Chains A and B, each alone.
Chain A
């Protein structure tokens, strides 16, 4: 309806990005810094200056980065590894403050909630880490029988959503109950892995989820009532969803056939734009701090930066 460029503003190169659906290899900091996991290194790229930094490189043969996530203030970076560590990195100092172990298998997903960092694993378990204290491992949430590939705290901290290659979506309370750590909800309707998980920024209890190749749907939920408010065939595995306040839209990333981004109007779920370019499947979307730009990372070893939510 308005002008949404059909091409990316910038195309960063992402050589040796690992073409593995379950990983979460890109994140955009409040400080305008893109973190990007390419095989066994993480690169930082300022969208302000254009400066590039190789933050770290794994030490051991065969080890690679399996997830990254910035802390809110953008000065520390969490990094999950194929060797089941959650490392914590001070980005200015360029030092590694912690190397937290607890998981039995690779750590593919990460989400922050203040000083609690939540980590998910190929084992199916989710761990809460109090990164301030010595015994970092303060909770275990066990609601998945296979890889936790989607993990996101609600903006208001009241809920944590997790998505799995067991095709489950769980919504966790922020604090255990009498039963201990048990989901408030468990949605079984997806028929494929659910890596795409995102909270509506302007509707507290509303969650969007997206399914893998055998599912292909985007689903919207009320996590209070348990209702599916909407299911849309996206015709392609859905790797990531973001919400945009700017125009009240969602954007999702896809693979085969067209490897496109699709922008949808909420709550009508009408298709606004398709953003073509990527020549292989999209792996991840992440959003800039001003909300104007989405970064897509794909298996064609590029990051495209789309100015698709510009204001006035």
Chain B
């Protein structure tokens, strides 16, 4: 996941 890098 890139959960914390998503807008």
| Chain A residues packing against B (C-beta within 8 Å) | 19-22, 146-147, 165, 192-193, 195, 212-214, 237
Contact = CB atoms under 8 A, between A and B. Distances in A.
B5 A214 contact: no
Nearest to A165: B1
Chain A facing B: main interface SS: loop
Interface string B1-7: 1011100
Contacts, number: 22
A20 B4 CA distance: 8
A22 B3 CA distance: 10
A6 to B, nearest CB: 28
Contacts of B3: 165, 192-193, 212-214
Nearest to B5: A21
A146 B5 contact: no
Contacts of B4: 21-22, 165, 192-193, 195, 212-213, 237
15 contacts: A21-B4, A21-B5, A22-B4, A22-B5, A146-B1, A147-B1, A165-B4, A192-B4, A193-B3, A195-B4, A212-B3, A212-B4, A213-B3, A214-B3, A237-B4
Contacts of A195: 4
